[PDB]
Amino acid sequence: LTDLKFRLVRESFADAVSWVAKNLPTRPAVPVLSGVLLTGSDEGLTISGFDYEVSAEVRVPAEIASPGTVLVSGRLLSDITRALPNKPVDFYVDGNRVALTCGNARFSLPTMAVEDYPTLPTLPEDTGTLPAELFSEAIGQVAIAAGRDDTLPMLTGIRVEISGEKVVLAATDRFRLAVRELTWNALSPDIEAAVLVPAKTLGEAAKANTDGSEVRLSLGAGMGVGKDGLLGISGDGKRSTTRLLDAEFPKFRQLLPAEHTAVASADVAELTEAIKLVALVADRGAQVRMEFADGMLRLSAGADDVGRAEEDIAVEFAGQPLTIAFNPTYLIDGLASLHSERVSFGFTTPGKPALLRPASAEDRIDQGPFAAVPTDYVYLLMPVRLPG
Template identity: 50%
Template structure:
């Protein structure tokens, strides 16, 4: 194996493939990045039996062949290289990498021991890459991070014709985002539970091209696979991941159809005020929000400890009420919203609030539902 390749193109491809490498691989070869050189160029790939990543890129290949090297080490080396072409060659049991006057020699692992990557499922449809990345970034805000509840660490993707819905919850909050996409079959109806971390990283990394192809397959016994394909710097990028098993909670009914109190607030003002007031909130305590007389009063702290109060303008329709929320969860939802103004809609103080944009436009249908926290007396 011997080839010459553009430094930036190779570095980008290595970073794409190495991003999903396991921190604690069950086998040493799973920490490897497979480099395959042929007359068609290079293929870089990683696979840990759950998530696979593959990058195709152009290169001047002198000798065909393959090598398996430490993926994280190669990624670190590539980021540090000067802006000159990279030359790599397999020399016995080691790989030689030269860039300008920098030279590295890397140990290899047995290629024969590396698992075969899963095949990309048949395409289900396409979606604008920038729209998808933004929608996913909003949806994953509410995804759980507790591995003891794996179902809640995923984002449920529901496809109904040309509408795609993204849902996530960690039991304390819920995100719902809809967007338009282009299905292969006009009347397509399918659902999948995708690991939120993989989905978020993949959507963010595939914004170089104009669109992303989504490929979904459901296997036997409820086990399935989802694949994403797009373009990166210098070539095609593909990734697949196994779907999460389990029943995602039926959360759509949590969004109420009517509201007794709705407050319209400037988003930036509310974000900055919550940040300031929360500075004196003790850990695991709520920031109080009192809505009345077209004002929103925020309070935190109690007793002999530090206290804070701040007032901002609000257009309030309906009854006055006082409630409280985890300040970080509230900020997560606020920062995920677009537009200048937001609506906070309540049925009553002890029930969840539904936060949405007032002026973000029809293209952004993101809703964030947040459970209240008990206020200290």
């Protein structure tokens, strides 16, 4: 009579549990860390997961016939609720077991020790909001450039700078650097702060947290912005926290060139296919070579031992002709982050990084040198050394 009992629609329950249980660990130090908390009250069901680094909570409406809290296996519950019949799900605790009935199917699941489950962290005070679309695009553009080596933790984060209504996101692995600037709705107009957030987690909290709604970011307020060690992300009845990274981000502003000795533009899709096609003869995704001259670009790869490949594509180009080589995965990564019809290229040496930035079908381009065009997105890519 005092144990959790409720009923709700299957698809909502299935979605809520799977969103929370995706974050969960399959290899759990403490076994309780594989559970999800289920809490019922006031015509709503709350589902919570914590692993010490990321926490996640979701509230969905439910017909709560009695209130309480229970801890059950997150992935098992996720699996069952997705495979159940599309019919109302009944769930009630019976001491040390949970009863899940739905149509003519009946489950009896064991419970876990709620008492041993870690307390979920409190989200900081709110700092600003921005559309979910925008937050999803910006994080994905930048996160692709972060390092994936925990021995170098200064590279594994996404830097978040706030200056009033303007936000700058940056990530780098020493070989590419991605910087995205955007405007948000700030709660206070006087914030002047920067934090560092793990890229793998923050990329996730946007790659599928996309919807049509608003995203609220919670870092603190006034003097306390950043100082709780957490970033909160909210919207759509979902709340997550992410432990902040303690490392120092590199001073990346030095690396952005103010001037180019050659500039170029190409069709992003055309250029992506040509890279992928010529890279089929490269040794081990070694390198793709780009030859720029007089309104054309020749992409090439290979050696005489495995095979060679060339494709000529139309580009716009100004400056002295140049050949420059890149890791083809890193180049495609940058092109795929631009989200524009065309790419604009900024070159200096074949031994200094190239600037990639988005361009429209209506942007156009004198021997130079050519000033850098201000852009909300930039992808700085280091070249690789040509054979010989």
